[PDB]
Subunit: 121 residues, 4 copies
């Protein structure tokens, strides 16, 4: 990944580590816009489909007229590190930001940014 993309990991990690330990708010996400800005968010757990952290980030970016997002990552609390977006997120990301990459762990546990279509054939 680029150093710009590497900053997303730092930002999402700082976000989740900065809030009280919660079962409702347990994952942070950060995304990079095509114009260089970073947007963050935290998940909202609910059985009716409370948004994943990634979806909160999408709404936060949209609130800032961010336009295209080029990369996204999610980081779990309790030092869990990078978590791949769930299938719901993969679908919303493909549909609203088809040019986006997601940061996931490679075969060696190392961060890599992959095109959303690779995660949702």
């Amino acid at each position: 990944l680029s150093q710009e993309e590497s900053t997303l990991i730092e930002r999402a990690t700082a976000t989740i580590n900065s809030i009280p330990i919660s079962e409702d708010y347990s994952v942070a996400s950060a995304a990079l816009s095509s114009d260089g800005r970073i947007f963050t968010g935290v998940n909202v757990y609910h059985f009716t489909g409370g948004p994943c952290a990634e979806l909160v980030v999408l709404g936060t970016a949209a609130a800032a007229a961010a336009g295209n997002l080029t990369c996204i990552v999610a980081i779990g609390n309790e030092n869990r590190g990078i978590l791949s977006p769930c299938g719901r997120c993969r679908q919303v990301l493909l549909d609203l930001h088809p040019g986006i990459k997601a940061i996931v762990k490679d075969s060696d546990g190392q961060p890599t940014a992959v095109g959303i279509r690779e995660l949702l054939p």
Copy 2:
């Protein structure tokens, strides 16, 4: 409404008015935390249940360690004004912020802050 509650309407209105007209991003929301901070967000439309503006606000508040939220409102694009929270939002709000009020239009069309339970009556 209280002065603070009125400010939520202004903030959410400014937020939705500021972004490109979109079918995907068409409602803004603003919520007040107990400490007086305001958090905003815009909906993300998706058939799988992309979050309402209110839920984006909840995640934005949580990201800032806002704690308990006391009031929330949603404002539609294209001068639609106050929109009540939908049923899913009411459930999430009740479960995560039971002390919260939502701003809705009363029977005379005037803004009123209503306890979340009163929006999910028995």
Copy 3:
């Protein structure tokens, strides 16, 4: 409560008592069509918003070309009895079957059918 409405309770109760005890599948629902038919369903728990039992009923009715539904009820496992529809279900029910009633417990814990609009005052509309 009408005889037909009461049958919804019996049916949903039968359904939840006819499946293994599960944390994924823990509530049953039944609805009545204007054509007299009854449609059932159970919930599918998932954090991304797996459907409530009521929503599974809606898709089951739709698969049978049921048309308009007039009443719905949900019955919980662990002998919980009648469970009011959640906010999400209230919205979907109002939007897709605006004339529907939901069976809920009254003050004395007894079954009563109320109009969906009564369960969502000051509705989201534009």
Copy 4:
């Protein structure tokens, strides 16, 4: 494609073709259980995440104590044929029926049954 896989396509197709054309109810799904039954369903469109046809099938199978589902397909109205499950369905399917296959179109447009994990690659 095996006999039972072709049969699921036929059952889902008959289901969607048998109901009035609707923007709310526009996709049917069918799934096979290991105990020798087939369950159908149609989608319920709603912005809060009304269930996909596949999720209606999952609740219909659950209502019948079906246990393990081994194959699923979705068929669109107006002669659209096979539709791949969306990302949310893939996630729910993986989590609740990890042994399931979904019928999708291959590169030639022909039906193929693929393990659910293949549809959510790393």
